[PDB]
Write a protein that binds this ligand. Sequence first.
Ligand SMILES: CC(C)Oc1ccc(-c2nn(C3CCN(C)CC3)c3ncnc(N)c23)cc1
Ligand SMILES: CC(C)Oc1ccc(-c2nn(C3CCN(C)CC3)c3ncnc(N)c23)cc1
Ligand SMILES: [Mg+2]
Ligand SMILES: [Mg+2]
Lengths: 218, 221
Amino acid sequence: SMERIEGASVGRCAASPYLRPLTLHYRQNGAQKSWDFMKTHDSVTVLLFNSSRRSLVLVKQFRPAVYAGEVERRFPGSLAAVDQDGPRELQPALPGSAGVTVELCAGLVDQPGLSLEEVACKEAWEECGYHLAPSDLRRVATYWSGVGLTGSRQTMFYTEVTDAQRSGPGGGLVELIEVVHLPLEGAQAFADDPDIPKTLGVIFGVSWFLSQVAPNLD
Amino acid sequence: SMERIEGASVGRCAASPYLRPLTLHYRQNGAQKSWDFMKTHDSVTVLLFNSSRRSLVLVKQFRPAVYAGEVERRFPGSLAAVDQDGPRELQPALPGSAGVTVELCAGLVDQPGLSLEEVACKEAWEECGYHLAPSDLRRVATYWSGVGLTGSRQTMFYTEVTDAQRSGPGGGLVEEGELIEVVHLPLEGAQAFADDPDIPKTLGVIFGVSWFLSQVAPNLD
Ligand SMILES: CC(C)Oc1ccc(-c2nn(C3CCN(C)CC3)c3ncnc(N)c23)cc1
Ligand SMILES: CC(C)Oc1ccc(-c2nn(C3CCN(C)CC3)c3ncnc(N)c23)cc1
Ligand SMILES: [Mg+2]
Ligand SMILES: [Mg+2]
């Protein structure tokens, strides 16, 4: 989560492996309709509870999409259509902290040879520094995210760890990610504080752990 | 959520008045970087608890993007790049139920002069037929939906309603041709509804049920 961002500029977006524009044409109950959407990948998330530190493991990082959307709120029109000349430097622009979010460890399912559990284990090592095995993972929920513009499905896993599995670092492969250990005592106040940029996966992860897992511990 | 879907095809979308893909170029830790994202407005959601029926109020509708993703999920390559020879008929296709989702009532922060609570009330009227008062909405949470591809912020509201407050029809706006069905989920079987993986549900529904049962339901009796 290196909040140090410079040279922020918005340019044209032609072709991406992550954003593929498509149109579904269809008839619903006889009525001809169309819908423009983006083909994107499914994903997985994992909530880790470190029972030694009595803390939940989260990740903090810079999200360029969040930063861009935040520049638009405080300076309307900053994200207008870019001409063919080249990327337009965002002026005025916000500090990189505007794009800094707190999330669950997450990763895309964009490699055909890895299971959902294997993607979750790979991401927990690269981002959080914890050694996980697929047999240590439990499925919490599988849901659809962004039903309006994408049909992506995200699967949330839960797992319990100690420092004995933190045999190395996260922070991406080098990617700049800061690992966050949230003590259980202040976890609910963390999730409810709008001053922190959080995802729904974090709010639900914390809420689900405290209401269903924590009362059955010890 | 009429599940009769026919003629499903996928077409190239070169120019879309609804899609706004952009790329952010920036400098971080001294190493030039780029990121592909979509400019989307913010949104609101509202969870309703009908005390007269002791049921949470949800919406069910056909989501074309969800349908396409499920066809692709069962038949990879269904959404391969489309050539210039018109729309490509989806063959094989799936029954329309594969795109039918259960969601919370939700709308976009696009109408000027309307606060977040108002936009939520208008969506509850247009989609669920309930007439709400904005000052009666309790703010549950505010958060960044889809941080990887969008910078949109979503705010969730909650309020209790009665049968008498359902002073409007259902369905949404017929201007877009929307076909939205209202669902009343009984309270004693709501958690099993959110855990059963055999229904296309959003995280907002799963969190909404969980939050209601642990933060609102004990204080009712
Ligand atoms: C935020 C999200 C959960 O809700 C949405 C998002 C987009 C559309 C949409 N609405 N529309 C209309 C616009 C104008 N009306 C008259 C016809 C079609 C689209 N068209 C192409 N792609 C589309 N994703 C849409 C609807 C609901
Ligand atoms: C919530 C999360 C699971 O969703 C994501 C995550 C990352 C990207 C993305 N990741 N990347 C690269 C970054 C550098 N390398 C090392 C990894 C992939 C992108 N590049 C351009 N646009 C992009 N939307 C991306 C998209 C969606
Ligand atoms: Mg990763
Ligand atoms: Mg609507």
